[PDB]
């Protein structure tokens, strides 16, 4: 749920281009969605999930 | 803001009875404690207006409570004004 | 030389005529061609003498400002348009 380490479950919620899917298509509760954004960008700071495949 | 153990200490030491938190006496004491502590935080940065609002509100609350107590009785007001050391 | 121009009319009043003249001055000493657009309102066709004298006065107002090249001969439409040229420096 609120964790960030489980990159495996976190991966399917992001695009191959590196963007984040909006909650409209997914169909999830908004608070879950903001917690997900928190977790993904916290991962981004620590150099686990790339910003994009540009480099 | 005020930590729980400090609140317990002040209510035990200063209150009239056990679990007597409804008294205006403890109200005034706790408000004075909080404002005296917050003097440290407004001693710095001199711009946090959005809490200056709360400080003014609580000062006004203390003023009104003390006025009501003095209007109702004199002895308790004298005991407070001498013991706590405020207003002057 | 660019093409610059302001409206004309023989019966124009005093002050605005002088401001127009001063504007034409600024344009000439900044190198602008002289073009005239005078619109004819109604029955101005019976004042040939005074109209000619007023046009002559207008040109005389440029006695020490520029040099005259052409003079009107025929009319096509409602107006005749003449071109004036900058004066050689002395």
């Amino acid at each position: 749920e609120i964790d960030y380490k489980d990159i495996a479950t976190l991966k399917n919620y992001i695009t191959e281009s590196g963007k984040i899917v909006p909650s409209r298509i997914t169909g999830t509760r908004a608070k879950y969605q903001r917690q997900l954004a928190r977790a993904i960008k916290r991962a981004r700071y620590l150099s686990l999930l790339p910003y994009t495949d540009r480099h | 803001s005020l930590s729980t153990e400090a609140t317990a200490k002040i209510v035990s030491e200063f209150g009239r009875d056990a679990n007597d938190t409804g008294s205006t006496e403890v109200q005034v004491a706790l408000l004075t404690a909080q404002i005296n502590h917050l003097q440290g935080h407004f001693a710095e940065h001199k711009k946090d207006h959005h809490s200056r609002r709360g400080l003014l509100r609580m000062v006004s609350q203390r003023r009104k409570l003390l006025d009501y107590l003095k209007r109702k009785d004199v002895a308790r007001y004298t005991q407070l004004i001498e013991r706590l050391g405020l207003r002057r | 030389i660019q093409v610059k121009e302001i409206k004309f009319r023989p019966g124009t009043d005093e002050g605005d005529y002088q401001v127009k003249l001063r504007s034409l001055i600024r344009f000439l000493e900044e190198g602008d061609k002289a073009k005239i657009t005078l619109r004819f309102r109604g029955r101005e066709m019976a004042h040939q003498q005074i109209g000619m004298e007023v046009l002559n006065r207008v040109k005389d107002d440029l006695q020490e400002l520029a040099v005259v090249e052409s003079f009107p001969t025929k009319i096509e439409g409602r107006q005749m348009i003449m071109v004036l040229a900058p004066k050689k420096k002395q």
């Binding site: 620590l46 150099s47 999930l49 | - | -």
Partner: protein, 100 residues
């Protein structure tokens, strides 16, 4: 009274200092009467994007509840050292063990 979770970065070829490095932090925090809960090292892992050249740096995991000053000076130690790389610390949310 205040939990903290700490993970930082370290140079890949400098894995030799890791034992004594973590020992001197754990000695400092034990002198700070901290209560450790679990330790782990995921090992070197290739990172998503190259940062100041370099690749596949080494990781670390800690866990401690302790006062504030000590985390301040250990943060400063992270600061002036140049053999160390990105350091990040979270706030409270209590303590959780395991979770490799």
């Amino acid at each position: 009274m205040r939990h903290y979770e700490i993970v930082f970065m370290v140079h890949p070829d400098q894995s030799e200092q890791v034992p004594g490095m973590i020992e001197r932090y754990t000695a400092a925090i034990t002198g700070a009467e901290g209560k450790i809960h679990r330790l782990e090292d995921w090992g070197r892992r290739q990172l998503a994007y190259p940062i100041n050249k370099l690749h596949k740096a080494h990781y670390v995991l800690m866990n401690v509840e302790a006062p504030q000053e000590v985390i301040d000076e250990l943060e400063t130690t992270f600061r002036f050292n140049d053999a160390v790389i990105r350091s990040m610390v979270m706030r409270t949310k209590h303590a959780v063990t395991e979770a490799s």
